[PDB]
């Protein structure tokens, strides 16, 4: 039991539940283990963004040197975004690394990530593939995220065109997820993605 402040996570845990954001249904948090070292966060895709309609889950773990070293956070629900690994949920944000601070609240982190959804940070990416697509075709990126949000985050409408291309490959007997990451990573080019699929 080397977890320093189990009495802060508790306070910051109240804080989040009692926040206006939670009643506004933008962010919410839940406990996973007794000791209080791993929570489960959930945020709503901000409106006017391909993430709109989506409900995303976050894995929040607290390391031993907590206050001082930031908490490790990952995106459980599959998201397509410059700053989140499209296949691991690893995030890349200044505050979740080195630019972290003493009194940064969990609520400050959940809102921060939500804000991140509204405006990526392409130059300090985590996923080279996503960041590139997001720059060389901000339209495709959006259409691609609107889909990912739908298939994985329970968001509404998605491109009926892309579903067609996911069908032609799944026909060959490929795994759905795999198929999607290939098509999204290769600019939705049925030929060039089937390529990647075989490597």
């Amino acid at each position: 039991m080397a977890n320093i402040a189990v009495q802060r996570i508790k306070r910051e845990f109240k804080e989040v539940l009692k926040s206006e954001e939670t009643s506004k249904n933008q962010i919410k948090v839940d406990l996973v283990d007794e000791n209080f070292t791993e929570l489960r966060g959930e945020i709503a895709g901000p409106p006017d963004t391909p993430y709109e309609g989506g409900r995303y889950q976050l894995e929040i773990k607290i390391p031993e040197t907590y206050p001082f070293n930031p908490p490790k956070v990952r995106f459980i629900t599959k998201i397509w975004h410059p700053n989140i690994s499209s296949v691991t949920g690893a995030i890349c944000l200044d505050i979740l690394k080195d630019q972290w601070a003493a009194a940064m609240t969990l609520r400050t982190v959940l809102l921060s990530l939500q804000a991140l959804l509204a405006a990526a940070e392409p130059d300090d990416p985590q996923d080279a593939v996503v960041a590139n697509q997001y720059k060389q075709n901000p339209e495709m990126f959006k259409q691609t995220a609107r889909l990912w949000a739908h298939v994985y985050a329970g968001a509404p409408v998605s491109s009926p065109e892309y579903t067609k291309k996911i069908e032609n490959l799944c026909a060959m007997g490929f795994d759905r997820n795999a198929v999607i990451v290939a098509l999204s990573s290769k600019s939705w080019d049925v030929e060039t993605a089937t390529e990647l699929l075989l490597s």
Partner: protein, 72 residues
Amino acid sequence: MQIFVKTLTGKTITLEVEPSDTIENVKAKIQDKEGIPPDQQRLIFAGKQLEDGRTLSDYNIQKESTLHLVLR
């Protein structure tokens, strides 16, 4: 026996083959039927690229089954 080879342009042919046939001669037969050089064909079945070395039954592909062709 006969099997079906489907490309990603939609086209779908039905060609005569033997279970004992290796993957290369199936390609060979694909060549003979459509003119595509085996030298540039890749056959996919159930998300795997059948290696030139194994046969149809070796892979357990029963007749009437569908293989996918992905041109290099």
